[PDB]
Amino acid sequence: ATVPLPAEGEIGLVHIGALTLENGTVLPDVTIAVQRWGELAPDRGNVVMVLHALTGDSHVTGPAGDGHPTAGWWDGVAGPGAPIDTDHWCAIATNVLGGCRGSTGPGSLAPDGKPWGSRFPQITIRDQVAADRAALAALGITEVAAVVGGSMGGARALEWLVTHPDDVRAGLVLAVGARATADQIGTQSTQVAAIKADPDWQGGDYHGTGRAPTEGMEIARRFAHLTYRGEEELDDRFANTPQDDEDPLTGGRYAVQSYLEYQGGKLARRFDPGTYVVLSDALSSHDVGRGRGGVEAALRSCPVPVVVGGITSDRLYPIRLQQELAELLPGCQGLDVVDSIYGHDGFLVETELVGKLIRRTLELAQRLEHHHHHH
Amino acid sequence: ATVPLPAEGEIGLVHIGALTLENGTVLPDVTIAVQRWGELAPDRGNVVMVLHALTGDSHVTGPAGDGHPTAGWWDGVAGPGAPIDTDHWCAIATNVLGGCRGSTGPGSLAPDGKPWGSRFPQITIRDQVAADRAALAALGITEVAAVVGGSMGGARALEWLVTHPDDVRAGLVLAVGARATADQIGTQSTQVAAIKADPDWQGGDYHGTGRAPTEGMEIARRFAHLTYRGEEELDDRFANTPQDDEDPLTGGRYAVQSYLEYQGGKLARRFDPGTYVVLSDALSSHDVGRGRGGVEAALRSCPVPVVVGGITSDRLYPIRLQQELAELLPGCQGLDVVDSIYGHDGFLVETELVGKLIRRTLELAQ
Numbered sequence: 001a002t003v004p005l006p007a008e009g010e011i012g013l014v015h016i017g018a019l020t021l022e023n024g025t026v027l028p029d030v031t032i033a034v035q036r037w038g039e040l041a042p043d044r045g046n047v048v049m050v051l052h053a054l055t056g057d058s059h060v061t062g063p064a065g066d067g068h069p070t071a072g073w074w075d076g077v078a079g080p081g082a083p084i085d086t087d088h089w090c091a092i093a094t095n096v097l098g099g100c101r102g103s104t105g106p107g108s109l110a111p112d113g114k115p116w117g118s119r120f121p122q123i124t125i126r127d128q129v130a131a132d133r134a135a136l137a138a139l140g141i142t143e144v145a146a147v148v149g150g151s152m153g154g155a156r157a158l159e160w161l162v163t164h165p166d167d168v169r170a171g172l173v174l175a176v177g178a179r180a181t182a183d184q185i186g187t188q189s190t191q192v193a194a195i196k197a198d199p200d201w202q203g204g205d206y207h208g209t210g211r212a213p214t215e216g217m218e219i220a221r222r223f224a225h226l227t228y229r230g231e232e233e234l235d236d237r238f239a240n241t242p243q244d245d246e247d248p249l250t251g252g253r254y255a256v257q258s259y260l261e262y263q264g265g266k267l268a269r270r271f272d273p274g275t276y277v278v279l280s281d282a283l284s285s286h287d288v289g290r291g292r293g294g295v296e297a298a299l300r301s302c303p304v305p306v307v308v309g310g311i312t313s314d315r316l317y318p319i320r321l322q323q324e325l326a327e328l329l330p331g332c333q334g335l336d337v338v339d340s341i342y343g344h345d346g347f348l349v350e351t352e353l354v355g356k357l358i359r360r361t362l363e364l365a366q367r368l369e370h371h372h373h374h375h
Numbered sequence: 376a377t378v379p380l381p382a383e384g385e386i387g388l389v390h391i392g393a394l395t396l397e398n399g400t401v402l403p404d405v406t407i408a409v410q411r412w413g414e415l416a417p418d419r420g421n422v423v424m425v426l427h428a429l430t431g432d433s434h435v436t437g438p439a440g441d442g443h444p445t446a447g448w449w450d451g452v453a454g455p456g457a458p459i460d461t462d463h464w465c466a467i468a469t470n471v472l473g474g475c476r477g478s479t480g481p482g483s484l485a486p487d488g489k490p491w492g493s494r495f496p497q498i499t500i501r502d503q504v505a506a507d508r509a510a511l512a513a514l515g516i517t518e519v520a521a522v523v524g525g526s527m528g529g530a531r532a533l534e535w536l537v538t539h540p541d542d543v544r545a546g547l548v549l550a551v552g553a554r555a556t557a558d559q560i561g562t563q564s565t566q567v568a569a570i571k572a573d574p575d576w577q578g579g580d581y582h583g584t585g586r587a588p589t590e591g592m593e594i595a596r597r598f599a600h601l602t603y604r605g606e607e608e609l610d611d612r613f614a615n616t617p618q619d620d621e622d623p624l625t626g627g628r629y630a631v632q633s634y635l636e637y638q639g640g641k642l643a644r645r646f647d648p649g650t651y652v653v654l655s656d657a658l659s660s661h662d663v664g665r666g667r668g669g670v671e672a673a674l675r676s677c678p679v680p681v682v683v684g685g686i687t688s689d690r691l692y693p694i695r696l697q698q699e700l701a702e703l704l705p706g707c708q709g710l711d712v713v714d715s716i717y718g719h720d721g722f723l724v725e726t727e728l729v730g731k732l733i734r735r736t737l738e739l740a741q
């Protein structure tokens with residue numbers, strides 16, 4: 001039983017039915033929202049699975065409007081003759097399980113006709129791969145040419161490569177580690193505590209109450225945005241300068257402060273706090289080594305050709321983590337470094353430099369697929 | 376009469392009267408808490424001023440108990456034989472202006488007998504130096520051999536050296552920069568917003584209501600504690616290991632999360648949210664160049680012999696900031712590099728390596 005791909009650029013909803021989660025909970029009636037660019041090859045051997053990060057969605061490329069609150073999160077990276085060449089490749093992006101942009105998440109109605117809220121299960125990165133796999137299977141896709149993602153996207157791509165090495169030709173893994181680190185769990189669990197401390201959280205059951213913990217989420221987002229930026233670049237841009245016509249020595253704002261307020265407010269206009277909590281806990285859960293004897297054993301086991309990218313100034317997934325991935329994956333020829341001042345967010349900002357790592361990944365994927373014989 | 380020094384180890388309260396603050400606001404009836412170790416020399420010429428950081432107090436050295444929630448924040452640094460050798464030196468530490476362990480802060484009673492709360496003015500690092508100097512003068516002390524501090528204590532040390540070069544013989548400036556960075560203001564201002572978001576903040580007039588924004592302050596402290604850690608040390612200590620037998624895939628805690636919850640909980644038993652906010656805003660205000668032609672002009676103006684120390688793994692005051700200080704201060708012979716895994720908090724953890732920089736500071740004092 002198969003469902004069609006939606007028209008290029010348009011959101012489709014793929015109903016995958018019940019999903020068994022890693023912790024044994026069965027999540028009934030899951031829907032995954034999908035967008036796609038490029039035509040699916042007759043052998044279905046040309047799928048590039050584009051995996052969004054924490055606040056991304058299915059909208060990889062294109063303008064805001066027509067139900068999209070933002071332009072594509074990798075705008076220009078996909079299209080005819082772009083780094084993801086949609087004259088040859090079928091670029092498919094899901095909204096991750098737990099999301100708020102069309103896929104089943106805490107805001108979605110449970111079988112009892114009420115929002116999941118506090119009843120939404122704890123999900124892992126492996127759960128997110130399982131939901132994406134079932135979505136692709138519902139579209140009649142069983143094999144993918146390449147998985148490509150940065151950050152939570154990189155965690156998704158890596159778990160996909162390690163879990164289904166027989167069903168993926170190649171991967172780009174950007175700005176992530178093999179497992180969540182203490183620092184990342186530290187900041188992720190404290191961002192969650194910020195949301196859960198807001199009185200409007202209502203134990204997670206705020207959905208449809210007309211009150212939401214957006215203030216808690218804005219606080220979390222201000223702290224998260226700093227982890228995503230380059231320390232030096234921030235100081236070059238704002239230093240200790242005041243906001244326009246305000247005096248910080250008598251309670252006015254600094255320019256960086258005003259900026260973080262703005263970033264907070266942007267997110268509150270387009271993103272659900274419950275989704276923030278569920279995806280931040282999923283990020284804390286990241287560990288390719290779990291149930292496999294640890295990170296070294298998991299990665300040494302994986303034969304898939306993988307391009308690994310790190311950003312020089314990344315303060316959240318520092319370069320030592322992508323060095324460790326590159327060294328342990330036998331299919332990784334060595335580390336690619338994105339020389340960016342923009343920190344972790346450089347995987348979204350440096351579209352030309354990331355563009356080149358994507359081109360080499362898909363050059364590799366095409367050669368491997370041409371030489372890969374499967375049912 | 377001068378105010379007498381308290382007996383060694385004991386808290387004294389030094390009333391300094393009204394204080395004019397940099398923003399113009401006048402703060403009446405200021406008290407500064409002091410503790411000291413060692414005898415004041417007959418000539419009153421052997422004072423080493425110890426300047427605590429964000430959540431420190433006057434309690435530099437000794438055990439917890441007898442009115443002290445914690446042991447000395449620099450235990451062993453001052454004493455007989457110690458880096459601050461109390462056989463020769465008089466080690467004096469204040470509780471900073473704005474603090475909650477004996478000095479005038481937001482929790483202290485204003486002249487109308489109600490807590491300052493939301494009436495407490497915005498103070499700067501420079502105001503903290505003016506208040507400490509007033510305390511010393513009331514004790515009959517107009518000159519100091521040396522000032523020593525890290526973090527907010529480094530900011531205080533630096534402003535002291537740069538504002539009053541004729542009244543200090545030598546300085547130790549640890550783990551700070553000439554001015555607050557955009558990143559430091561980002562995290563400091565967001566820690567403040569977390570406390571003001573807690574509904575128990577009550578506009579800052581929560582004092583005496585029986586509700587305080589300790590939840591907000593725990594959140595702030597959890598984020599702040601991460602900025603103080605070495606990234607690699609933290610991962611070496613906890614990794615992604617669970618707390619005890621808890622299972623994080625069904626709602627249990629990670630070992631680091633549990634450690635961060637302990638950090639927030641411990642600070643909530645000993646520290647006031649209003650002080651957190653007020654001192655966080657003074658850190659954001661840090662700028663040795665304000666009113667002085669900027670940072671280069673101010674630092675190049677300072678003739679004082681200074682030891683500048685930086686922690687290699689520091690992620691909040693990265694070592695490029697101490698290299699800038701070491702270069703521009705004419706009295707600095709070069710950057711003292713503290714090879715530590717412990718991050719910013721290295722300046723508190725590495726008492727042996729910091730001990731050496733203190734001895735070199737006191738050699739320069741003579």
Ligand SMILES: N[C@@H](CCO)C(=O)O
Binds near residue numbers: 053055345
């Ligand atoms: N800023 C991006 C990167 C997260 O690592 C996001 O919000 O999705």
Ligand SMILES: N[C@@H](CCO)C(=O)O
Binds near residue numbers: 431526720723
């Ligand atoms: N960790 C210490 C130093 C932070 O600068 C404190 O809380 O004061």
